[PDB]
């Protein structure tokens, strides 16, 4: 009912998908092998004989326009309205000893084809299914042309004795190619949608369908789990996805709803894996900085440090003991980072002696974009708010640490975060599809990305 991620396909997107599937189908239809047709007569050039229309080949199979119709709560209807086929072949006729022969062109006009497609999902695998439940093909007219004018009688025999058979067979071969194509090419194609999509050595994203695709008058909605996960952990997140409702729009081909839940499961997985941490040593503090990680330097501003731990190096460990939350409002995405920062003196035997522990938090904006079928981000921070948690060097006002923290964060900590946000995460795109004309509109509890698709 409430997925973590939804992909809504508009009539515009289905109009494009129709054009692409028609292109593929056109090449296969053109390969139909038309049977030879032979018969006999008692109707001159001289009474007697037999005749045959043979070695026919489809020179052109024109599919001018096609459409995909959304049938509410039923599925999709694929239709081709005014198709025309041009065929070239050989003919021969015989009456007593007279042999006649030549080439002919056949024009099949006004052919209409239609096929109903039932969309579903395999609940265990999270993969989509598409089946063809019916197909019909009809023809409006057939015209035969032969360069030799003297065989009008033979074209009349074609109409009286061959045309119906030839039309019936063509309509069946056409629906055979259509039905075969759905099972053998269409379903496997949409099954290229990713299910368990691995990002790195720590996480993956589950994009498996949690319901069968649902068709309404103006939308085809594909509901996906949309949960980041660890290949080591198994527990579901303790929070739930929000309802994501938005009006049908037709300006773009697809609409991606990325819930706040989706983003927060990413914070949960990486924090639980223990990777949201960093150790800072004095050798990592840019030469340009006045702040040095040594008890000597810290002694210039804090209490017992230089005294209690003389001429020792200091290390600052930064970590997240709780998963960082993200909220989505019409204003955009907001990130609420909370980090523990603990300072240690390095002892004569290299062991770490705790000096103090503070908590640091702020609000940050998360700008989200698209880039090569992946989502990428950039985090910017507001003022850093500090709180003293514990001290082994006596009481002191946490404000004394404001300057060093104002430097260390944007210079050394934030960049590591933004390098990873820029590397990004894969979107659920099927094979050979790329997104363009992207627009973003934040909504309450989810980000909505609208986009056009290009297939190759
Ligand atoms: C933000 C990230 C998420 C992005 C999600 C992307 C949105 C989903 C894309 C849908 C619209 C975009 C158009 C691309 C698809 C067009 C078809 C295609 O690529 O190949 C056809 C393919 C053609 O295959 P092919 O010949 O080109 O190559 C086949 C295989 N290889 C490459 C190995 C040779 O299959 C066919 O059978 C064509 C026959 C046409 C049948 C009639 C048309 C059907 C119309 C499609 C119905 C749509 C149902 C979707 C179900 C949704 C399930 C989730
Ligand atoms: C919404 C943006 C679009 C892209 C999708 C990302 C969804 C948002 C997921 C939220 C979790 C963000 C965690 C930040 C880590 C970088 C991104 C990631 O998940 O890849 C892990 C990668 C892999 O882990 C790393 O190597 C990054 C090291 C992070 C630096 C250590 C400090 C962590 C402190 C936690 C808060 C984040 C830093 C901000 C501090 C501000 C000071 C108060």
If you had to describe this structure to a student in words, what would you say it looks like?
- The PDB classes it as antibiotic.
- The entry lists the keywords bactericidal, permeability-increasing, lipid-binding, lipopolysaccharide-binding, antibiotic.
- It forms a monomeric assembly.
- The entry is titled "the 1.7 angstrom crystal structure of BPI".
- The chain is 22% helix and 44% strand.
- The longest helix is centred in the middle third of the chain and has 39 residues, at 152-190.
- It has helices spanning 11-29, 152-190, 260-272, 295-299, 305-308, 402-423; strands at residues 5-10, 37-40, 50-62, 66-71, 75-95, 98-122, 127-138, 141-145, 196-198, 204-206, 214-215, 219-224, 227-229, 254-259, 277-281, 314-319, 325-329, 332-336, 338-346, 352-361, 364-370, 374-381, 385-391, 425-426, 433-443, 446-455.
- The radius of gyration is 35 Å and the shape is rod-shaped.
- A hairpin with a 3-residue loop joins strand 11 (214-215) and strand 12 (219-224).
- Strands 2, 3, 4, 5, 6, 7 and 8 form a 7-stranded antiparallel sheet that branches. A 6-stranded antiparallel sheet has the order 11-12-1-14-26-25.
- It folds into 2 domains: 12-191, Super Roll (Bactericidal permeability-increasing protein, domain 1), CATH 3.15.10; 1-11 and 192-456, Bactericidal permeability-increasing protein, domain 2, CATH 3.15.20.10.
- The structure holds 1,2-diacyl-SN-glycero-3-phosphocholine (PC1) (2 copies).
